[PDB]
Amino acid sequence: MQVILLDKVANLGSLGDQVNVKAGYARNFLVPQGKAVPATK
Amino acid sequence: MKRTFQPSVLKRNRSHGFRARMATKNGRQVLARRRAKGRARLTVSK
Amino acid sequence: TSKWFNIDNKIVDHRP
Amino acid sequence: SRVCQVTGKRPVTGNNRSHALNATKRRFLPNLHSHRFWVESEKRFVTLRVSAKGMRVIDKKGIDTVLAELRARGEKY
RNA sequence: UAAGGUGAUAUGAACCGUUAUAACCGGCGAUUUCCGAAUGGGGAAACCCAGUGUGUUUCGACACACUAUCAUUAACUGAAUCCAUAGGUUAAUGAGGCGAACCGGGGGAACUGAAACAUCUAAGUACCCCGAGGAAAAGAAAUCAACCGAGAUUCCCCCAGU
RNA sequence: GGGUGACAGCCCCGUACACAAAAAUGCACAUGCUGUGAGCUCGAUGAGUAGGGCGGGACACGUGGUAUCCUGUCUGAAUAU
RNA sequence: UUGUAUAAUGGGUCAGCGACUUAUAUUCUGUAGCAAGGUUAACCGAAUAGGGGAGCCGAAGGGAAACCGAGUCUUAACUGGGCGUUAAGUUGCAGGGUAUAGACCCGAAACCCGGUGAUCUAGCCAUGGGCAGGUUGAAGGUUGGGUAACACUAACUGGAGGACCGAACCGACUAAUGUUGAAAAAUUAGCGGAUGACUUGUGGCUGGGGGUGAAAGGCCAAUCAAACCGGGAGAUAGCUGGU
RNA sequence: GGCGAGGCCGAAAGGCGUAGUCGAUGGGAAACAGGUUAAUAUUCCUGUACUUGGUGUUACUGCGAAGGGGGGACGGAGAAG
RNA sequence: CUUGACACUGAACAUAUGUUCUAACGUUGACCCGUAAUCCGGGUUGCGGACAGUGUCUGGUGGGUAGUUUGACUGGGGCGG
Numbered sequence: 001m002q003v004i005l006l007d008k009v010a011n012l013g014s015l016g017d018q019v020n021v022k023a024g025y026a027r028n029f030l031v032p033q034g035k036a037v038p039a040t041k
Numbered sequence: 042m043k044r045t046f047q048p049s050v051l052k053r054n055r056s057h058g059f060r061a062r063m064a065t066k067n068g069r070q071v072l073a074r075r076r077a078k079g080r081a082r083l084t085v086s087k
Numbered sequence: 088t089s090k091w092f093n094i095d096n097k098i099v100d101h102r103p
Numbered sequence: 104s105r106v107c108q109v110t111g112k113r114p115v116t117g118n119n120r121s122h123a124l125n126a127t128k129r130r131f132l133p134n135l136h137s138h139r140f141w142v143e144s145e146k147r148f149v150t151l152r153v154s155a156k157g158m159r160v161i162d163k164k165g166i167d168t169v170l171a172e173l174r175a176r177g178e179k180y
Numbered sequence: 181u182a183a184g185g186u187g188a189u190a191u192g193a194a195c196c197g198u199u200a201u202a203a204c205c206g207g208c209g210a211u212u213u214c215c216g217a218a219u220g221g222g223g224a225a226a227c228c229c230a231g232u233g234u235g236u237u238u239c240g241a242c243a244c245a246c247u248a249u250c251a252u253u254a255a256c257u258g259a260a261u262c263c264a265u266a267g268g269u270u271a272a273u274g275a276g277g278c279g280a281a282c283c284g285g286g287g288g289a290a291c292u293g294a295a296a297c298a299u300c301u302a303a304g305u306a307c308c309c310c311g312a313g314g315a316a317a318a319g320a321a322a323u324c325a326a327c328c329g330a331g332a333u334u335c336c337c338c339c340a341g342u
Numbered sequence: 343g344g345g346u347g348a349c350a351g352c353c354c355c356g357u358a359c360a361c362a363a364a365a366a367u368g369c370a371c372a373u374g375c376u377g378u379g380a381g382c383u384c385g386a387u388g389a390g391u392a393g394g395g396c397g398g399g400a401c402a403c404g405u406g407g408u409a410u411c412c413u414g415u416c417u418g419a420a421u422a423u
Numbered sequence: 424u425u426g427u428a429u430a431a432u433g434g435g436u437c438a439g440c441g442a443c444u445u446a447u448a449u450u451c452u453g454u455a456g457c458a459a460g461g462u463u464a465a466c467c468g469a470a471u472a473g474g475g476g477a478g479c480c481g482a483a484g485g486g487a488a489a490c491c492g493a494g495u496c497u498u499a500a501c502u503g504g505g506c507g508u509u510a511a512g513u514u515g516c517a518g519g520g521u522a523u524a525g526a527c528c529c530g531a532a533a534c535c536c537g538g539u540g541a542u543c544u545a546g547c548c549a550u551g552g553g554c555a556g557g558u559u560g561a562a563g564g565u566u567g568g569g570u571a572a573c574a575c576u577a578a579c580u581g582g583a584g585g586a587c588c589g590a591a592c593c594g595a596c597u598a599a600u601g602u603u604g605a606a607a608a609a610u611u612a613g614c615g616g617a618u619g620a621c622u623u624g625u626g627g628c629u630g631g632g633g634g635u636g637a638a639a640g641g642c643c644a645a646u647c648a649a650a651c652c653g654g655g656a657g658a659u660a661g662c663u664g665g666u
Numbered sequence: 667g668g669c670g671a672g673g674c675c676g677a678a679a680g681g682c683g684u685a686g687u688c689g690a691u692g693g694g695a696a697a698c699a700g701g702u703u704a705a706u707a708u709u710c711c712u713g714u715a716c717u718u719g720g721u722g723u724u725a726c727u728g729c730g731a732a733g734g735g736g737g738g739a740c741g742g743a744g745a746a747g
Numbered sequence: 748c749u750u751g752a753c754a755c756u757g758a759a760c761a762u763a764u765g766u767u768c769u770a771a772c773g774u775u776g777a778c779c780c781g782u783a784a785u786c787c788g789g790g791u792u793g794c795g796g797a798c799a800g801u802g803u804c805u806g807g808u809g810g811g812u813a814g815u816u817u818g819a820c821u822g823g824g825g826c827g828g
């Protein structure tokens with residue numbers, strides 16, 4: 001799943017950056033805790 | 042000898058009465074069948 | 088219904 | 104009932120066909136799971152009984168859109 | 181519309197009416213006890229027990245009206261929690277139940293036939309359930325055709341027992 | 343067609359035919375109000391979808407060399423060039 | 424039925440009812456029309472008229488088929504051989520047979536589907552009642568003897584027990600009667616339990632491949648190796664009876 | 667034990683179940699003797715009583731629950747007064 | 748009933764395995780609220796934790812259950828042939 005980071009999580013990428021993450025990792029952690037928005041555009 | 046019909050009005054009405062027929066969904070079907078036949082007496086109450 | 092000597096077994100099964 | 108709230112998937116019937124083709128009735132059940140989705144518009148967690156196909160639909164379309172669709176169809180959540 | 185009439189077994193008594201309020205027939209209204217979806221609570225149907233608000237009393241009491249549940253909408257109120265939500269109260273609108281068959285859909289047999297039986301048939305039949313209507317359903321080509329063309333859906337006769 | 347003391351065109355009720363509505367209502371018109379919008383130009387062309395793997399079902403078609411339709415599960419495009 | 428006076432079946436008798444039908448398709452016969460042709464179906468028509476020739480059957484066959492065609496196939500090809508040319512059809516009406524439907528009529532035991540049943544009986548749950556009368560005498564206790572203290576023992580007391588005898592009540596071991604009974608399970612005379620794993624009244628719960636069962640396939644409304652009622656249903660019947 | 671607003675569950679029908687609400691076979695106030703009718707009586711009559719609740723005067727006064735406590739409220743057998 | 752694959756299902760580290768974490772998920776743990784409530788729902792916390800559980804596919808087992816089969820001749824049938 002392609003997601004755009006809105007913060008710096010040092011594990012995988014920098015702020016404002018598109019990257020491939022697993023769907024559950026995006027669905028359960030990032031999007032409910034900020035830090036990422038899906039690449040809806 | 043003790044025969045199979047030992048009558049009781051209370052048990053008769055709780056078993057076959059009109060309110061028990063309306064309480065179960067298939068009892069309402071029973072009343073529909075008896076009304077469509079045209080019975081003088083639907084249930085055991087009268 | 089039926090007669091008891093026809094329901095009985097010792098006299099009905101008289102010639103097995 | 105085992106009905107998906109998003110995609111409406113419900114159990115369907117089929118057959119068990121063996122090696123000798125003996126057909127006996129069986130049901131296909133959806134892959135239903137009760138999941139708490141974080142809705143941002145309400146700052147809330149909404150629990151939905153949704154299949155995994157429904158979860159994929161959620162992730163594609165956005166939780167707000169399908170919540171609007173559910174409210175239009177009238178079922179509570 | 182009328183010289184007769186008060187339904188029948190069913191006579192009789194008391195009467196009404198004869199030129200138009202007798203009776204009879206039709207349209208519109210009025211009353212419509214109690215049970216029954218039954219709907220104020222309950223119930224062993226045709227019964228028991230109320231709450232609230234008006235009004236009347238001879239101070240003993242009495243009459244009427246409202247009070248079910250669910251769905252939608254709106255108002256007021258409102259938790260854990262600070263806003264909010266969940267919830268509660270009210271008001272308005274709608275539904276419920278019954279009915280022969282036909283119709284759409286969700287489930288769905290077996291005896292039987294195969295000269296036994298298991299794939300197959302019976303048969304998506306019987307039956308159960310849901311929903312709607314005066315009909316329903318389907319319907320305006322991501323359809324067929326064959327190098328020529330036809331032009332939504334439905335129904336009958338052929339194609340073809342091919 | 344029925345009745346009348348036995349079988350009635352001319353005894354009675356009727357039938358062909360010609361009429362009749364104070365009141366309510368159905369239908370087809372015509373006409374007001376309310377709600378609704380036509381005409382022309384330009385643009386757009388229904389995505390967890392079509393299709394695919396596995397299991398089933400519907401097509402006269404019993405998986406067969408099996409097209410096509412539906413979907414319980416897992417995936418998944420092109421998008422008027 | 425090889426064979427019935429048969430002592431093999433059926434029938435007490437009378438009267439009324441009772442069993443080869445109907446629809447569609449196909450072949451054969453008779454008869455009627457037209458004839459290398461015959462005939463329409465749905466539908467239009469107010470129209471048993473008329474229209475409608477969509478189609479169907481026939482006048483051409485051979486071969487698996489392309490294909491050829493009074494011929495064709497086989498084969499590399501037939502002196503050959505197989506099938507054909509060498510005989511008029513079609514549409515009504517009536518009839519025989521067949522096919523699909525219940526298919527000449529009546530008759531199963533059984534299978535499935537949806538319901539009504541625990542007022543009888545099986546078990547459980549709640550809450551009330553019943554058990555005359557008479558015996559036996561456990562533990563424990565008190566006093567006394569006894570012991571270092573127990574232990575042990577005598578008398579008195581006590582009132583145990585799926586204890587004993589025996590009515591109510593519950594049951595059902597034996598015999599006779601009855602067996603178209605007084606009774607679709609009893610009567611009479613004896614018999615077992617009778618303070619318990621007891622018995623009973625009112626009410627509730629468990630449902631049919633299911634319940635319940637101190638277990639007999641027992642009981643579930645005089646029915647149980649799968650209740651009753653309606654439905655599939657006119658199941659099926661190479662079997663019997665009747666016609 | 668039944669039904670059961672919301673609710674949890676289930677192809678549909680429906681299954682269970684909380685708040686509630688029903689359900690005696692149980693708990694809850696009070697009447698006895700005499701007489702009478704062809705047929706009723708703890709119901710009628712005679713005599714003598716008892717219970718609960720509403721109203722109104724009198725006197726004193728802290729009353730109030732959907733909440734806390736007590737009570738209702740519980741076995742078998744036996745023995746004697 | 749059990750085995751595996753895919754899904755719900757995630758993140759670091761070390762050599763598919765192992766260790767560690769919380770955010771999915773479970774809680775028939777504690778407390779608060781709806782609430783007059785041992786159901787249910789929401790909130791905080793704790794304990795597990797990508798395990799368990801469930802869906803589709805799949806191998807094993809499976810008289811727990813169901814549908815049925817179990818030939819004929821025959822000096823009667825079975826046994827023998």
Ligand SMILES: N[C@@H](Cc1c[nH]c2ccccc12)C(=O)O
Pocket residue numbers: 090091092094095096602608
């Ligand atoms: N004959 C006895 C017993 C009996 C009753 N039913 C029976 C049925 C079959 C045999 C015997 C019987 C009687 O009549 O009471």
Ligand SMILES: [Mg+2]
Pocket residue numbers: none
């Ligand atoms: Mg009511």
Ligand SMILES: [Mg+2]
Pocket residue numbers: none
């Ligand atoms: Mg009422």
Ligand SMILES: [Mg+2]
Pocket residue numbers: 221222229
């Ligand atoms: Mg009440």
Ligand SMILES: [Mg+2]
Pocket residue numbers: none
């Ligand atoms: Mg309706």
Ligand SMILES: [Mg+2]
Pocket residue numbers: none
């Ligand atoms: Mg069979």
Ligand SMILES: [Mg+2]
Pocket residue numbers: 294
């Ligand atoms: Mg057969």
Ligand SMILES: [Mg+2]
Pocket residue numbers: 295
């Ligand atoms: Mg047969």
Ligand SMILES: [Mg+2]
Pocket residue numbers: none
């Ligand atoms: Mg329509």
Ligand SMILES: [Mg+2]
Pocket residue numbers: none
């Ligand atoms: Mg063209």
Ligand SMILES: [Mg+2]
Pocket residue numbers: 348
């Ligand atoms: Mg005469």
Ligand SMILES: [Mg+2]
Pocket residue numbers: 387
């Ligand atoms: Mg398009």
Ligand SMILES: [Mg+2]
Pocket residue numbers: none
């Ligand atoms: Mg597809």
Ligand SMILES: [Mg+2]
Pocket residue numbers: none
């Ligand atoms: Mg394919």
Ligand SMILES: [Mg+2]
Pocket residue numbers: none
């Ligand atoms: Mg002969």
Ligand SMILES: [Mg+2]
Pocket residue numbers: none
């Ligand atoms: Mg002989």
